[PDB]
Design a protein around this ligand. Structure first.
Ligand SMILES: [Mn+2]
Ligand SMILES: [Mn+2]
Ligand SMILES: [Mn+2]
Ligand code: NA
Ligand code: NA
Ligand code: NA
Length: 320
DNA sequence: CGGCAGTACTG
DNA sequence: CAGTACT
DNA sequence: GCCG
């Protein structure tokens, strides 16, 4: 990154706006930061800064203060609440509104939350694993987790296909969590397996806590056996084979990549989700779907790219 | 002016 | 529903 | 915050 001396200051503002709930301003900062982290050379001119997509007048100004000053004075007026809001919103299941409410009620530490806050079931689990959920795991451990789920699934039906997605599939050396997609080529025998699969993984002691138990999504907590093991976040999604490519695409990400691809689809009168790529989608003036359109056949990820008019990208080049 | 992705749970 | 989460 |  040609421009760390700027980006590092901007990220502090981005996080501050984010934990305070100012989601769109934070989004603007996030995009400018990436734009600047992928510029070839250092930024040296206000009109060079303004040169970059995702950097406008306000952001060019800030970068000009940074290079002439070495500093950004807005940093000195960030509310004293922000570190605490960040502390609280790093509890799984607590976001900006919950963090702000706890702050308003006088909470300042996780000890305050533990002893005095009313927690949802999810948030109590999040708090119990507060440290573990902030830590990444080696790639090799994600493999063991993927393989544990697959062996449990295949025990019921040898035909079940299980694939670790997320950062694992984008090739990263460490992973924040494990994202396992399950389907079945027969288009049928994925149905109703969660009951048995989760029960099997629980029987082991492998699954330690459940956060979400939906008909198609599971989000929870696992821990491999033996000493030196941390609790890890595990997500499982079960999908019909007709949706495999779009589910794979979704679940592999990155998040920014998905949002970028979905924005593109919208420009073309199409819609892309975890379920399907659709065409002839009808939307209102405000960008909201008011007519569904037609599902397009997407047997493979490459088909989604092709139908969108884009060159295929392997998972590793989707790490946006 | 106003969208900024699209979707799934929770209670 | 608002809130939070997933990529 | 940015951009159409
Ligand atoms: Mn993940
Ligand atoms: Mn995950
Ligand atoms: Mn632990
Ligand atoms: Na620009
Ligand atoms: Na949180
Ligand atoms: Na008190």
């Amino acid at each position: 990154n040609h421009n760390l001396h700027i980006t590092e200051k901007l990220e502090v503002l981005a996080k501050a706006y984010s934990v305070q709930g100012d989601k769109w301003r934070a989004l603007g900062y996030a995009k400018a930061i990436n734009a600047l982290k992928s510029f070839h050379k250092p930024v040296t001119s206000y009109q060079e800064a303004c040169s970059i997509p995702g950097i406008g007048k306000r952001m060019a100004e800030k970068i000009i203060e940074i290079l002439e000053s070495g500093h950004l004075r807005k940093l000195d007026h960030i509310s004293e609440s922000v570190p605490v809001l960040e502390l609280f919103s790093n509890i799984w299941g607590a976001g900006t509104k919950t963090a702000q409410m706890w702050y308003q009620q006088g909470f300042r530490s996780l000890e305050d939350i533990r002893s005095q806050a009313s927690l949802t079931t999810q948030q109590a689990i999040g708090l119990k694993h507060y440290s573990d959920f902030l830590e990444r795991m080696p790639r090799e451990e994600a493999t063991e987790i993927e393989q544990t789920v697959q062996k449990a699934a295949q025990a019921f039906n040898s035909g079940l296909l299980c694939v670790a997605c997320g950062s694992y599939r984008r090739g990263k050396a460490t992973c924040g969590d494990v994202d396992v997609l399950i389907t079945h080529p027969d288009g049928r025998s994925h149905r109703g397996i969660f009951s048995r699969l989760l029960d099997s993984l629980r029987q082991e002691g492998f699954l330690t806590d459940d956060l979400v138990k939906g008909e198609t999504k599971y989000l929870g907590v696992c821990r491999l056996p033996g000493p030196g093991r941390r609790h890890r976040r595990l997500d499982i999604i079960v999908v019909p084979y007709s949706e495999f490519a779009c589910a794979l695409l979704y679940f592999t990400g990155s998040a920014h990549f998905n949002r970028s691809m979905r924005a593109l689809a919208k420009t073309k009168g199409m819609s892309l989700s975890e379920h399907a790529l659709s065409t002839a989608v009808v939307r209102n003036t405000h960008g909201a779907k008011v007519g569904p359109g037609r599902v397009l056949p997407t047997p493979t990820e490459k088909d989604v790219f092709r139908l969108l008019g884009l060159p295929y990208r392997e998972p590793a080049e989707r790490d946006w």
